[PDB]
Design a protein around this ligand. Structure first.
Ligand SMILES: [Zn+2]
Length: 44
């Protein structure tokens, strides 16, 4: 059976950073928060 068994299932919220899917964006946001991205000690 060769049908690309990479990524069983598809969802609108799939953290590419590590590779974790969620149910509601909300839950994802809290996850992506601790992931690569523009966030640090700014000046203001
Ligand atoms: Zn992640």
């Amino acid at each position: 059976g060769s049908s690309g068994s990479s990524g069983t299932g598809e969802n609108p919220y799939e953290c590419c950073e590590c590779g974790k899917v969620f149910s509601r964006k909300d839950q994802l946001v809290s996850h992506q928060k601790t992931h690569s991205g523009q966030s640090g000690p700014s000046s203001g």
